[PDB]
Amino acid sequence: HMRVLGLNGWPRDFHDASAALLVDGRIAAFAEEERLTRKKHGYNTAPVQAAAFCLAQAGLTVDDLDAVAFGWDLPAMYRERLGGWPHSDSEALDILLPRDVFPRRTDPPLHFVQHHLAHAASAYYFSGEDRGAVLIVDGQGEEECVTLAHAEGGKITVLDTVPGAWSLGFFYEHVSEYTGLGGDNPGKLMGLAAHGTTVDETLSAFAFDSDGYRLNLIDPQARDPEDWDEYSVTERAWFAHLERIYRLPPNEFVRRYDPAKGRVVRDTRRDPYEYRDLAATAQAALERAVFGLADSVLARTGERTLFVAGGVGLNATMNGKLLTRSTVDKMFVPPVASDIGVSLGAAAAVAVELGDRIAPMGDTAAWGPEFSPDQVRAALDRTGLAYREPANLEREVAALIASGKVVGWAQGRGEVGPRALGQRSLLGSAHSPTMRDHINLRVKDREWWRPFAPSMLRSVSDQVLEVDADFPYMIMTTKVRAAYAERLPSVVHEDWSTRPQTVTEASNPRYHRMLTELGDLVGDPVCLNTSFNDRGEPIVSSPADALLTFSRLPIDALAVGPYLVTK
Numbered sequence: 001h002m003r004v005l006g007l008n009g010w011p012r013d014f015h016d017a018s019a020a021l022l023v024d025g026r027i028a029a030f031a032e033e034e035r036l037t038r039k040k041h042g043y044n045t046a047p048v049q050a051a052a053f054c055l056a057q058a059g060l061t062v063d064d065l066d067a068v069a070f071g072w073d074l075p076a077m078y079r080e081r082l083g084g085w086p087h088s089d090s091e092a093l094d095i096l097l098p099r100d101v102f103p104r105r106t107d108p109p110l111h112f113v114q115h116h117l118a119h120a121a122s123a124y125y126f127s128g129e130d131r132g133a134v135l136i137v138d139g140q141g142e143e144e145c146v147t148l149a150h151a152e153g154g155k156i157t158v159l160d161t162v163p164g165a166w167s168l169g170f171f172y173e174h175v176s177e178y179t180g181l182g183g184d185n186p187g188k189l190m191g192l193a194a195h196g197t198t199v200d201e202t203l204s205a206f207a208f209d210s211d212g213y214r215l216n217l218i219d220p221q222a223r224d225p226e227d228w229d230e231y232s233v234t235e236r237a238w239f240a241h242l243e244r245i246y247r248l249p250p251n252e253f254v255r256r257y258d259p260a261k262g263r264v265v266r267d268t269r270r271d272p273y274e275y276r277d278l279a280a281t282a283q284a285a286l287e288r289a290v291f292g293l294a295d296s297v298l299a300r301t302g303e304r305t306l307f308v309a310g311g312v313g314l315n316a317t318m319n320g321k322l323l324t325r326s327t328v329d330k331m332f333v334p335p336v337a338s339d340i341g342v343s344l345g346a347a348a349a350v351a352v353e354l355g356d357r358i359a360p361m362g363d364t365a366a367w368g369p370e371f372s373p374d375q376v377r378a379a380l381d382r383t384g385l386a387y388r389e390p391a392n393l394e395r396e397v398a399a400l401i402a403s404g405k406v407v408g409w410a411q412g413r414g415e416v417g418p419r420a421l422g423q424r425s426l427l428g429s430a431h432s433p434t435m436r437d438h439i440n441l442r443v444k445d446r447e448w449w450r451p452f453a454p455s456m457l458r459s460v461s462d463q464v465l466e467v468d469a470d471f472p473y474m475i476m477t478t479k480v481r482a483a484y485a486e487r488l489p490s491v492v493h494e495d496w497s498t499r500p501q502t503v504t505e506a507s508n509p510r511y512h513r514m515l516t517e518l519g520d521l522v523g524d525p526v527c528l529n530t531s532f533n534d535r536g537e538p539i540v541s542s543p544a545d546a547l548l549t550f551s552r553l554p555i556d557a558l559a560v561g562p563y564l565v566t567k
């Protein structure tokens with residue numbers, strides 16, 4: 001047995017802390033810190049709880065680990081940008097795995113893995129494909145924002161990098177901030193781009209070529225020597241530039257006491273919808289730049305399989321278009337493309353270095369905590385709420401869904417990454433023409449223009465989608481076929497695009513069953529599947545989490561374990 005605990009998250013100036021445990025190349029456990037702490041984005045923290053969970057889940061202690069792997073070259077970053085790496089391996093271990101939570105007889109080997117390598121590792125080793133081109137597109141690793149590499153024979157070899165100042169991630173963030181959606185919500189920007197019109201995709205900043213892009217707005221060698229990313233530098237350049245060329249100035253945040261809620265709430269001066277054309281344009285500029293990069297690495301390696309990771313990898317809209325490109329046959333992007341994924345990537349890199357074979361993820365991301373019926377009961381009995389234990393839960397849930405009701409679904413092991421995949425999901429009819437507005441405005445109280453996405457049986461996805469492939473992670477848009485382009489109004493765009501999760505019975509028997517039962521009711525085993533949370537809070541993880549969010553939202557029912565709660 002080779003056991004490698006991979007980590008991300010650090011007390012100084014970090015985000016998306018997470019922890020993954022590989023055992024014999026298999027994922028034993030994987031969790032994001034935010035899910036357990038309830039603090040969004042897992043900011044400025046070692047993945048303390050996530051690692052504790054991995055170890056408990058696998059019944060291990062630190063002393064049972066062959067290696068601890070960290071998904072950045074921290075010593076390097078501390079050398080170049082802070083004037084020295086002051087930590088012994090043991091001292092660093094004390095910070096990443098505090099002894100009061102993680103008792104240990106001795107230190108495990110500590111490995112720092114280069115940030116993009118980890119990103120790449122988390123794509124390649126888990127793709128189930130044995131070779132391909134690697135495209136890593138990011139905010140910024142230690143010094144680079146893009147990495148093009150060749151993945152073959154269990155090896156990842158770098159061909160080229162792009163300096164952070166030219167970051168597509170930072171660009172897209174900055175635009176996201178400029179619009180008032182916020183730099184921490186780029187996904188929203190993507191959503192918004194769909195409502196805009198693109199005028200000049202260069203933004204008078206980018207110049208696109210056949211190998212990607214160049215950004216004459218900023219000197220590519222511009223370092224913010226103070227910090228250890230070029231975020232501030234790119235932020236000034238982009239904000240001043242956008243204000244010059246775009247009709248709207250930066251949207252501003254407004255903080256006022258709301259007597260209705262009894263607190264200071266943050267709002268935006270302008271409606272971010274006003275910025276839709278700027279979103280469209282940013283989206284298009286990102287796509288264009290990324291199309292170039294993809295073509296370039298594909299051709300430099302002579303592969304037709306593409307691997308994508310780094311946070312830009314979360315842009316399903318851009319991925320869908322990569323997939324349909326003539327330069328692309330197959331595509332894998334892991335559900336943990338962002339930094340949460342570099343704990344797993346670091347682990348994989350190390351495990352591979354230690355002689356392990358890494359198994360494929362295989363159409364599921366359900367690696368987080370799960371809870372026994374007794375545990376769920378404990379959480380239920382805490383609330384003093386009445387609940388049933390349906391003979392056939394999956395059928396009853398299907399019936400509620402078919403009737404246009406919204407059902408919280410908390411089953412098995414939490415999924416990892418930003419997307420609910422039927423372990424912690426809010427479910428609704430994919431068939432209702434009013435469901436989208438209902439969930440947006442009445443249920444989640446979020447923006448009217450936000451889109452929804454479907455889960456469907458893999459077994460019918462060939463009839464529903466123009467591509468007969470696995471889409472396990474909702475990480476890629478594709479188009480529906482004619483016969484379904486109006487059947488599914490809540491989850492299909494006017495242009496027939498959608499962002500689907502395909503569901504194998506192996507991946508999720510319960511979800512699979514529920515969908516099957518739904519098909520027997522409304523013809524298609526397809527439903528609307530949106531993240532289970534009140535907006536701005538992370539996806540629920542524990543039954544107590546589920547009950548809390550259920551109690552605060554006008555959801556109709558909660559299916560948590562084998563129990564069903566109604567309002």
Ligand SMILES: Nc1ncnc2c1ncn2[C@@H]1O[C@H](COP(=O)(O)OP(=O)(O)O)[C@@H](O)[C@H]1O
Nearest residue numbers: 139140169170173186187311312314315338339
């Ligand atoms: N849907 C999206 N489309 C485009 N870019 C995105 C999207 N989601 C996240 N990003 C980008 O990913 C970046 C974060 O990447 P990540 O690898 O998680 O961390 P880091 O950049 O610190 O290495 C952000 O700069 C953000 O702009």
Ligand SMILES: [Fe+2]
Nearest residue numbers: 138310311339
């Ligand atoms: Fe990254």
